Homo-oligomer: A and B are copies of this chain.
């Protein structure tokens, strides 16, 4: 973005110009999202029908 100067004759020698100042926006990685489950071999053998569903 720039500003301007308002002068009767338009000589700017006694003054200061626009600088050029960069800026930036940073994207980052977040935390993981994790759903975890565990079950005993016994449970799968006798309890676990339809585990898919």
Contacts and interface: CB of A to CB of B under 8 A. Distances in A.
A6 interface: yes
A35 interface: yes
B6 A32 contact: yes
* Main SS at interface, chain A: loop
Interface in A1-45: 2-10, 12, 17-18, 20, 31-39
* Count of chain copies: 2
A18 B35 contact: yes
A42 to B, nearest CB: 13
B34 A7 contact: yes
A16 to B, nearest CB: 9
A18 B37 CA distance: 5
